[PDB]
Amino acid sequence: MKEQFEQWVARLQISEAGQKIIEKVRSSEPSRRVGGGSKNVSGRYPSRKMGVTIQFESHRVALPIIYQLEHDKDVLEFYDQPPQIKLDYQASNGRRLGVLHTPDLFVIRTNSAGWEECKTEQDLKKLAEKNPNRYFYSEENNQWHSLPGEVYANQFGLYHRIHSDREINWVLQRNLQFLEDYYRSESLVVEEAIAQSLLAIVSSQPGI
């Protein structure tokens, strides 16, 4: 387990401090337990990728991204409540303030690693209209970006990404919840005769 991570670091040439953050995130309990709040259905989800319980604040905002990451192959690991980052940013007045922030997820992929924060539509618009230098929209890639999060990512060899709920395909979510029971199984062996029967019926009729 450690050798593969070491080869990952060597291949991507992550700095000593970046490797320190990745190691800390890998071996640490989540910073805060998800609270019920007043408007968010919270809870925990079992993930066979990590093989542990991962906590989501919102079952329709962060949880879809968690489902993607669990069924995504590009993702190696996805920790929740990574240690706080002291994001430094200048407000509208001009004062450079440092605010502690906890990203929703920390995702380590097969070619990069970093932070991923899940938000909604109206939250992103109010935060952008109330903080010009903390969030903005790039219509080229059609993505929301946070200046201090991506700055901290770029000072550490990591990435920063904001996952909204505009880009999530809900049909994909429904089908993942449909086939999760078969995904959690480990020895799916269909009878050869029955599989051949369905293969014949499928190849004899397209678009069935």
């Binding site: 309990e29 989540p30 910073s31 805060r32 337990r33 925990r44 079992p46 993930s47 066979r48 093989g51 542990v52 319980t53 991962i54 906590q55 409540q81």
Partner: peptide, 15 residues
């Protein structure tokens, strides 16, 4: 807080 479980990352699966 008070009466709240520590944020432990619970293992899954049947042993």
């Amino acid at each position: 807080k008070v009466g709240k479980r520590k944020p432990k990352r619970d293992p899954i699966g049947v042993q």
